[PDB]
Amino acid sequence: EEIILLDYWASMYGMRTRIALEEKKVKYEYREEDLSNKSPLLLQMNPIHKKIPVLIHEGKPICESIIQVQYIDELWPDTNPILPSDPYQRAQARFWADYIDKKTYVPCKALWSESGEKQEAAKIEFIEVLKTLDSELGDKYYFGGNEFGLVDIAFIGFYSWFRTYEEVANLSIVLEFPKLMAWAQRCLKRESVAKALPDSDKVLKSVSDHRKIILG
Amino acid sequence: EEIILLDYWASMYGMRTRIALEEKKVKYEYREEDLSNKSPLLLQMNPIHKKIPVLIHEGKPICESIIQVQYIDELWPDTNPILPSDPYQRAQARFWADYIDKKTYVPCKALWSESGEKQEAAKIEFIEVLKTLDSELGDKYYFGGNEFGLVDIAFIGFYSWFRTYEEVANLSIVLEFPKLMAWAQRCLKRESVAKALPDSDKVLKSVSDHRKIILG
Ligand SMILES: [Mg+2]
Ligand SMILES: [Mg+2]
Numbered sequence: 001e002e003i004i005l006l007d008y009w010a011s012m013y014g015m016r017t018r019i020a021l022e023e024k025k026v027k028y029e030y031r032e033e034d035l036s037n038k039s040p041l042l043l044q045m046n047p048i049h050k051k052i053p054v055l056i057h058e059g060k061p062i063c064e065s066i067i068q069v070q071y072i073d074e075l076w077p078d079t080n081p082i083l084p085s086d087p088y089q090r091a092q093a094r095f096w097a098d099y100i101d102k103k104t105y106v107p108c109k110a111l112w113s114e115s116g117e118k119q120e121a122a123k124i125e126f127i128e129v130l131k132t133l134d135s136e137l138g139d140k141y142y143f144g145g146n147e148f149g150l151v152d153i154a155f156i157g158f159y160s161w162f163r164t165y166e167e168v169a170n171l172s173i174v175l176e177f178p179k180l181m182a183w184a185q186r187c188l189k190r191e192s193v194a195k196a197l198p199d200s201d202k203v204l205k206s207v208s209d210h211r212k213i214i215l216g
Numbered sequence: 217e218e219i220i221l222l223d224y225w226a227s228m229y230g231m232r233t234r235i236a237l238e239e240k241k242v243k244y245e246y247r248e249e250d251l252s253n254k255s256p257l258l259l260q261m262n263p264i265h266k267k268i269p270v271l272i273h274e275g276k277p278i279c280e281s282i283i284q285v286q287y288i289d290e291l292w293p294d295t296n297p298i299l300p301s302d303p304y305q306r307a308q309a310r311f312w313a314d315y316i317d318k319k320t321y322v323p324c325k326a327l328w329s330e331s332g333e334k335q336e337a338a339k340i341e342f343i344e345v346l347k348t349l350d351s352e353l354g355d356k357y358y359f360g361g362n363e364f365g366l367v368d369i370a371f372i373g374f375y376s377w378f379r380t381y382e383e384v385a386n387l388s389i390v391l392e393f394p395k396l397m398a399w400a401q402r403c404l405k406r407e408s409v410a411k412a413l414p415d416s417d418k419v420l421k422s423v424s425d426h427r428k429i430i431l432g
Contacts, residue, residue: 048315048348062307064314074303087290091278098280099264132264 003028006042006054008035010203012108012157013065014053015196019153020069022192024076066097069153083150096136096143097154103129104158111169112207115215123169134177141186148190152183156193159184163200164207219244222258222270224251226419228324228373229281230269231412235369236285238408240292282313285369299366312352312359313370319345320374327385328423331431339385350393357402364406368399372409375400379416380423 143151359367
């Protein structure tokens with residue numbers, strides 16, 4: 001139970017680790033990091049990347065959200081198992097989490113922080129992700145099949161940003177991807193997800209205010 | 217034993233999967249892909265990224281080299297185990313493999329394919345990787361500690377390119393990082409590594425000829 005999570009409230013990546021901890025019914029200390037004034041603990045525990053989320057367990061750091069989720073799953077594998085038991089299914093889940101990380105590394109920032117050609121580039125990339133994930137989900141209840149799993153955790157945090165993407169990047173998500181909206185609604189019925197995701201209007205307000213200040 | 221590996225002889229990433237298969241004493245079919253004329257099988261099995269290496273097991277694809285290595289380890293966990301048994305050690309091994317992938321994604325190409333400012337940028341990034349990995353290795357025999365492990369597999373393929381990096385990018389590796397040279401020599405004593413890594417002079421000749429043709 002000796003766990004600290006250094007995180008940023010609106011981080012879709014940190015939300016993954018918040019969800020995994022709640023899935024295991026783990027009590028932990030959440031600490032909010034100021035992204036423009038990172039704590040001494042954060043820089044000490046994540047000297048390589050200096051980024052949130054940072055999971056600290058018995059004073060030892062675990063970095064990278066998908067690696068944190070797997071560490072939590074391996075620590076408590078019998079309570080709400082996150083990864084599949086089958087090796088091949090496991091590899092597919094890791095592949096799609098990796099896909100999300102690779103393809104959202106830039107858009108996660110440029111979608112709200114840029115304009116013009118750099119924001120258009122990010123819009124194109126993110127729409128491609130939504131289409132690809134929508135096709136991979138198909139007609140299943142979850143990316144994990146019949147049960148909520150690793151890939152669901154890997155993407156559900158982005159739902160809290162859909163409203164922001166539609167408004168600051170002139171994207172159409174809710175009306176174009178009803179299967180993803182329905183999937184998000186299924187996931188939100190889990191207490192872990194409901195606790196982890198911030199209000200989407202709060203996200204938008206925060207991002208708009210920041211946007212409007214840094215670029216007019 | 218029903219395994220096909222679609223790979224490129226000089227791919228340091230594909231070398232990881234070659235090593236993992238040999239570590240498990242698995243007989244498999246290796247197929248060489250022409251990177252400028254990718255096979256129909258490759259595009260079929262890896263439609264998302266269209267890149268090697270692609271591992272095909274009972275006709276099902278597994279993409280991304282570090283994910284392939286873990287899949288092979290989980291299929292045959294008792295023969296030459298690659299990942300640690302301890303969850304925390306496991307997370308650290310995954311973190312350093314992820315670090316290597318993230319920081320070499322661009323240099324793996326720009327170091328030999330570019331010149332001027334883009335090659336200098338890649339040189340700076342790769343030197344930072346070598347320094348960081350050298351510090352993480354410390355005085356241990358392997359990145360995995362007392363035994364060859366995931367991070368060793370994740371980086372040992374780059375040794376076959378050290379000569380190329382020194383010659384085409386005017387880097388100094390062998391004389392600046394004796395601990396990494398000694399580590400590489402330890403790893404090369406394993407049959408899996410000796411079989412997987414191509415001759416470093418053959419790599420250089422191939423890369424120089426390609427370089428000299430595409431840019432004078
Ligand atoms: Mg499951
Ligand atoms: Mg080991």
